[PDB]
Amino acid sequence: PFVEDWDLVQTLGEGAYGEVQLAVNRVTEEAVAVKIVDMPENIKKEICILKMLNHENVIKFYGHRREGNIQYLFMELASGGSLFDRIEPDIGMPEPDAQRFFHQLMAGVVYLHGIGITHRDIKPHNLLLDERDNLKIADYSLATVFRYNNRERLLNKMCGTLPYVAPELLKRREFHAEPVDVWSCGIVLTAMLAGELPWDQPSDSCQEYSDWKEKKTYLNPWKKIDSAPLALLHKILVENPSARITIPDIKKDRWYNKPLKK
Ligand SMILES: Cn1cc([C@H]2C[C@@H]2C(=O)Nc2cc3cc(C4CCN([C@]5(C)COC[C@@H]5O)CC4)c(Cl)cc3cn2)cn1
């Protein structure tokens, strides 16, 4: 296909609304990723949020075009793929790689939270890598504003991916945005270090979640995780969101500051 001055060659992925494709300009040869959305006030909010974004660990937004019903969203091609494709099932990845990726994910989540934006769907599929293996947070179709004019807005909409969602989304009418994003980062850490998700959903009906609350760390995936990162996970994966660790305090954690290599 050809649109204006681009050639949509490779399918990079697909979401609820539309799909992402590779667009190499027939004139300049610049490689970008285009989100082609067929057909509400949700695309107005997405293009808006994307404009506000300027950070090394957040996907580059270039602009937006149109073709009647079909919308075109311009984004940086993350030429290194996704974090999901770097996690080996039942194993994970070397702990020094996991720590570096977790530092870069915290740098991205701090930035988004500082501009009053919550991603709302942090998981390995949304965490892309560039040429140098720099982590970039992608896909703002569920991103909402949680702070405006220094005033915090509580959330009520349930969204995300069940294995990554915090328990307060399923139990409470309204909840704070930042702890929900912190919880999903801990599930991403658990995935990087054990190549396995701890539970289907964080509910009182789910046995693997009950086991974690009963402190049974002698079970998988926890037994594949060293005591230092596991101590951090005990602070991130706390049910009551008011007792959960904040990002400034994750920055003071022993494993987060532990020198690693090889
Ligand atoms: C030089 N070279 C590069 C390659 C390709 C490997 C490189 C790649 O895939 N890059 C890439 C991929 C991108 C994917 C997305 C989307 C994220 C979100 N998912 C989901 C909706 C979430 O969960 C389920 C769905 O996977 C859809 C896709 C976006 Cl927004 C931007 C992207 C930019 N760049 C080959 N040669």
From Swiss-Prot:
Q: What is the name of this protein?
A: Serine/threonine-protein kinase Chk1
Which gene carries the instructions for this protein?
Answer: CHEK1
Q: Which effect does the record note for changing residue 121 to A?
A: Abolishes kinase activity
Instruction: Give expression by tissue.
Output: Expressed ubiquitously with the most abundant expression in thymus, testis, small intestine and colon.
* Annotated region (Interaction with CLSPN), positions in chain: 1-256
Q: Could you name the domain of life of the organism this protein comes from?
A: Eukaryota
A Gene Ontology biological process term: signal transduction in response to DNA damage
Provide the domain comment: The autoinhibitory region (AIR) inhibits the activity of the kinase domain.
What does the record give under GO molecular function? ATP binding; histone H3T11 kinase activity; protein domain specific binding; protein kinase activity; protein serine kinase activity; protein serine/threonine kinase activity
Its annotated function is as follows: Serine/threonine-protein kinase which is required for checkpoint-mediated cell cycle arrest and activation of DNA repair in response to the presence of DNA damage or unreplicated DNA. May also negatively regulate cell cycle progression during unperturbed cell cycles. This regulation is achieved by a number of mechanisms that together help to preserve the integrity of the genome. Recognizes the substrate consensus sequence [R-X-X-S/T]. Binds to and phosphorylates CDC25A, CDC25B and CDC25C.
Q: Where is the active site?
A: 121 (proton acceptor)
- Name the species this protein comes from: Homo sapiens (Human)
Residues included from the entire protein: 4 to 271 of 476
Quaternary structure annotation from Swiss-Prot or TrEMBL: Interacts (phosphorylated by ATR) with RAD51. Interacts with and phosphorylates CLSPN, an adapter protein that regulates the ATR-dependent phosphorylation of CHEK1. Interacts with BRCA1. Interacts with and phosphorylates CDC25A, CDC25B and CDC25C. Interacts with FBXO6, which regulates CHEK1. Interacts with PPM1D, which regulates CHEK1 through dephosphorylation. Interacts with TIMELESS; DNA damage-dependent. Interacts with FEM1B; activates CHEK1 in response to stress. Interacts with TLK1. Interacts with XPO1 and YWHAZ. Interacts with CDK5RAP3; antagonizes CHEK1.
